[PDB]
Design a protein around this nucleic acid. Sequence first.
DNA 1: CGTCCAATGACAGCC
DNA 2: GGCTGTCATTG
Length: 637
Amino acid sequence: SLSIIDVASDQNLFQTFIKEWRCKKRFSISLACEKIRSLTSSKTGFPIKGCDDTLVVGLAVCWGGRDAYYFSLQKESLDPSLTLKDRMWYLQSCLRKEKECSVVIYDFIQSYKILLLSCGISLEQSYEDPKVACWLLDPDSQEPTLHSIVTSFLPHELPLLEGMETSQGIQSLGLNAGSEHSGRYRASVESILIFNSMNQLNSLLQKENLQDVFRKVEMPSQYCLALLELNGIGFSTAECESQKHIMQAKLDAIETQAYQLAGHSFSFTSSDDIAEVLFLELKLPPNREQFSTSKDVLNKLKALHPLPGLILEWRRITNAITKVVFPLQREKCLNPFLGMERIYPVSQSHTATGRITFTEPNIQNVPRDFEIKMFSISMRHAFVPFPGGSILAADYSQLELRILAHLSHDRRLIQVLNTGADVFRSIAAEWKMIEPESVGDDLRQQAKQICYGIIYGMGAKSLGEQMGIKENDAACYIDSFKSRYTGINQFMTETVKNCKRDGFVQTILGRRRYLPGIKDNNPYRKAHAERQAINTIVQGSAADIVKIATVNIQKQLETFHSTFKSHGHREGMCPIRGGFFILQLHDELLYEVAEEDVVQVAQIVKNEMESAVKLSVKLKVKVKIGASWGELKDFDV
DNA sequence: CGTCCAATGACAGCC
DNA sequence: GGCTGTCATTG
Ligand SMILES: Nc1nc2c(ncn2[C@H]2CC[C@@H](COP(=O)(O)OP(=O)(O)OP(=O)(O)O)O2)c(=O)[nH]1
Ligand SMILES: CN(C(=S)Cn1[nH]c2cccc-2c1C(F)(F)F)c1ccccc1
Ligand SMILES: [Mg+2]
């Protein structure tokens, strides 16, 4: 059945364990975490950052069968000759290469950060996370749990999870300290399960030709994101508090001016109070198909009364305060080693198309610079580098357009993209009948939504509502698009044809997203899967290229510079040196770079992004350096 | 009965 | 009166 071998209990048992561990090219580990329920428990270990009530008491190692070698990280040991420092030397020796070696870890990112921050050990091997392999086999599946992995890929070992309800809680069984069971038993069971399950997962990856995407792209991306979560992103409380005051002052002016237009005071959060003022008092025309106060209704009423425009601006500013300012100042944390405050978002790579997003908080959703008549409110000014550094931004110009041109072989789109004329400003120039140089960011952003909207199947009705024209007139723009770019339309038709035949779509690297609704009887559900088939290939291939570029940049930074890998590595152990990954923005990479290395990192980042993948269209990359996320300026190198 | 896609998440407003 | 999804925002 099961066998748990406490290797720190005997010297001869420990030396035999180290001698065998140093010969294994593949094994699994699972950290044993327990919570300090009482001071009388007399449990020793390493404290965890954030969860100070939780200790790392040990570690389980498994390299075959149902045998778990528990590595006790407690001060007390049955063999006092094996001091904790001796065990740390041997644990560090076996977790760092000299020599290919693969370590299977469930929730690799958290385990990597805990091993570094709590135990002072930096992993230096090849990493395999089973939850990432489960995502490659089906990007639309539910986020994996230890119980779900065993239920699907190792059903014979299901009784080993009885009693421990935490197996179905996404988080690692050994890392979930909220369990009442010992970390020794939870880690020993998990190491045996994730090791044998990864063998079946690796077999399924090889059958689906995804074993190289797993080792070269996805798992190295997790390592890059692990350094990101260790770095965090700088945060200026003063700048965030300053713009909060400017926004709260504009709200008071709007509320004062709105009440005067209404004749009385009303609640901006109450739609009934808003509907009574506009429709029952101001006698504004209700919508066709309805006392609705949505964004679509208020935009049609802006031209009849100034109050709808004031309500729309109140909601925009209030959203920037209640859902951005408050979470950022709530999640901020002091970093004594850098002498500044930072925010540490958690990455999320279990997405439908392969994009990367962030949680707690979602830095990607920080609002752009929007004008306020009092000026511009730039929430991104609050994100600053460390004293003596600059924030570096490098983004692909139009990555999804250039991938679409490379896949559709459209000679006209390739010709337009090879020319330095902005497509969005050219669309707005034809739209509003203005010169391209006179197109503002608000109009260019509106033309951007129209461009990608039409490409991914937006209908004539929605296009008319976007372009502010009749539905009959909007269908002519779609007809012109399907005639002006016959290569794109041939790509859209063949993709739906191939997805109806295969039942899935493939990105540029081979990742499959299964879309069973492609043959559904419902006309809305069937067309939704058709639009998903077009978008998953383009948007998914863009995510693949960015992940490739991120991995290559990090490989180059760790060779050009012998400094610390992340800000967490400086804490686990000199002025700051190099560039530090802080944020990924789908088609844009943000790095915190010291002022001395700004020029070299900009050249390293730009070269790796342009040479990540070879397409039939040039991958144009722009680099911008500034004193904050909102003060970025063009940097030509 | 809802026809661009992807994503997170605090409140109005529930059923 | 807690429990969603909805309509904010970003790419
Ligand atoms: N389907 C869809 N995709 C979008 C939309 N907006 C952005 N995207 C995708 C396509 C490209 C990717 C990055 O968009 P950006 O906002 O960076 O715009 P861009 O096309 O890169 O141009 P630029 O960076 O010069 O603004 O996000 C949209 O409204 N619909
Ligand atoms: C008729 N038209 C065209 S073709 C503009 N265009 N150029 C593109 C290169 C790649 C996609 C493109 C589009 C698109 F938007 F159609 F998808 C247009 C549509 C709306 C407003 C103004 C012009
Ligand atoms: Mg961009």
